[PDB]
Design a protein around this ligand. Structure first.
Ligand code: DHF
Ligand code: DHF
Ligand code: NOH
Ligand code: NOH
Lengths: 287, 287
């Protein structure tokens, strides 16, 4: 009854019943449209164990989002290079963004979460007091009206899409409270099952822990919903290796001090305890 | 293996395992966060049979959305009164919209789908050439790049939310093509299982048929994803009546001529064939 079995079974389902589907990157995929999994957050943390997940990257990326950043260079210097390709000179130029500085991902998560509706200029522009701070609004609504069925943070901004180096794979998330517990559902339009998905699950589970902490709630469930759930054709053999491995108990996430605001979390405030994954499995990134 | 069994089983699941959850309307609910169902659209149409669904309302509402309307009065005169309460003088005044004309629902689906990002003024303002026509963009993308994993229409607009008489229950939808078939996934943040959900399923199935028709594709699946899936406490006895009834085969939807553009569909272009539902079950609307 290990929660990780849901992920492994989604992979198996795509390998057995998915359709071949060509893709933007020219790699090719096996694909299923519409999946859902539920990861309990109660006294455990869904950091996958059948391969080592890059937790440092997960944590630094989320802190960077919370700062409102859309500058990959700010994250890269942490040793977290996950957005570097998307902000590179040549990739940017390929999308027509030759005026843009390297690293400028466009009006993606950090900007939409903190400044939705503002006019994007450059990654380093001053957006203070502009647009909707959806992140803080979610927090405030959970505190004042936990029954609210409208507690959403939405990165999908049709007006801004043409400026984004990668339109968000994570279109929106919704929070929910019952019985003292905070849950989160992610709508992921496009899930690279081998590379992005394990990382993304940890990201939103971590966000839920952070928000529960500052709202005085306990973490409940993370519900992961997928649009195009796909396995790149060059991830088939790596995932078949992964599927042979037995899950180990999920770790725990500890928050090491009482933090009052989302902005105040720091890397050293977190400890993953009891994480004993199987070895890293290299999965190439389709660009 | 009837598709309707998924809906009936979601209702049963909420009745048995849902949590009590207070709500905005003061009615109270039994609630589950995170559900998903898949309704085939292949040679049948998921218009529920265990009660008669208001198909005329479904069809007229969708045509009204496609016209870009946010004026409930335009729909009401069709004998489709579903948005009238939300646009009524007293409801509007209760939300602080006393300057607003009756019927003005704010910048909801018709406006977001046709004019995302434009500045909302009144329901009757001229928005020609303003904002993003997401509906037409989806259509064009399906035709030119069916593999695209970004084919989204999003009604959730954080900037505009304060002006909406009801923030969209249908936050976004995504389209997907494989094997000549068009699928659609709805992210429904809040689902009134007794009243709205059966109606909403038919709406998005109908939208998928329309878009498949004009793009030369065959309908595939409608994937229905729910956030707060709930049964109002005063719908429990009506739904228990419904659950006793055997499903009948789903009907077929026929489109009676070749229509070239989404704007050109008319009520008389559609015929539901073979629909033999059990009788209407009155479910009161929580306001
Ligand atoms: N094709 C594709 N798939 C993605 O999942 C993806 C994408 N493109 N573009 C950007 C992006 C942003 N997120 C991420 C997340 C993790 C890695 C990644 O390379 N993680 C490796 C570890 C890297 C390291 O250890 O330094 C992994 O194996 O999870 C990259 C991008 N994700
Ligand atoms: N509480 C609540 N639930 C909803 O589902 C809902 C809401 N509020 N506010 C507005 C709204 C918009 N959609 C709809 C859809 C159908 C009906 C409705 O009354 N349908 C009846 C048939 C009405 C008739 O036959 O004229 C039904 O039983 O489905 C109302 C609102 N839906
Ligand atoms: O799985 C993903 N998660 C992300 N987290 O940031 C980024 C996107 N992705 C994956 C989904 C696709 O394989 C790819 C984006 O390509 P697109 O769906 O064609 O935009 O990256
Ligand atoms: O089920 C719904 N579908 C709609 N189609 O237009 C409209 C909203 N609803 C239901 C969900 C809730 O019961 C209610 C909206 O209340 P809220 O979730 O508190 O915003 O209406």
């Amino acid at each position: 009854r290990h929660g990780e079995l849901q992920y492994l079974r989604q992979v198996e389902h795509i390998l057995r019943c998915g359709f071949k589907k060509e893709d933007r990157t020219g790699t090719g995929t096996l694909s299923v449209f519409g999946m859902q999994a539920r990861y309990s957050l109660r006294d455990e943390f869904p950091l996958l164990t059948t391969k080592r997940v890059f937790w440092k990257g997960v944590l630094e990326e989320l802190l960077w989002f919370i700062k409102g950043s859309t500058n990959a260079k700010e994250l890269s210097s942490k040793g977290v290079r996950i957005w570097d390709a998307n902000g590179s000179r040549d990739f940017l130029d390929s999308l027509g963004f030759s005026a843009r500085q390297e690293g400028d991902l466009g009006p993606v998560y950090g900007f939409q979460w903190r400044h939705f509706g503002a006019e994007y200029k450059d990654m380093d522009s001053d957006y203070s007091g502009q647009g909707v701070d959806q992140l803080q609004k979610v927090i405030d609504t959970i505190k004042t009206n936990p029954d609210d069925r409208r507690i959403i943070m939405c990165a999908w901004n049709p007006k801004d899409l043409p400026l984004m180096a990668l339109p968000p794979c994570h279109a929106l998330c919704q929070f929910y409270v019952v019985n003292g517990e905070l849950s989160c559902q992610l709508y992921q339009r496009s899930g690279d099952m081998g590379l992005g998905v394990p990382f993304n699950i940890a990201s939103y589970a971590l966000l839920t822990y952070m928000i529960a902490h500052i709202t005085g709630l306990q973490p409940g469930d993370f519900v992961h919903t997928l649009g195009d759930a796909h396995i790149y054709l060059n991830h088939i053999e790596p995932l078949k290796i992964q599927l042979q491995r037995e899950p180990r108990p999920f770790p725990k996430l500890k928050i090491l001090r009482k933090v009052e605001t989302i902005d105040d979390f720091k890397v050293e405030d977190f400890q993953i305890e009891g994480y004993n994954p199987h070895p890293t499995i290299k999965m190439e990134m389709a660009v």
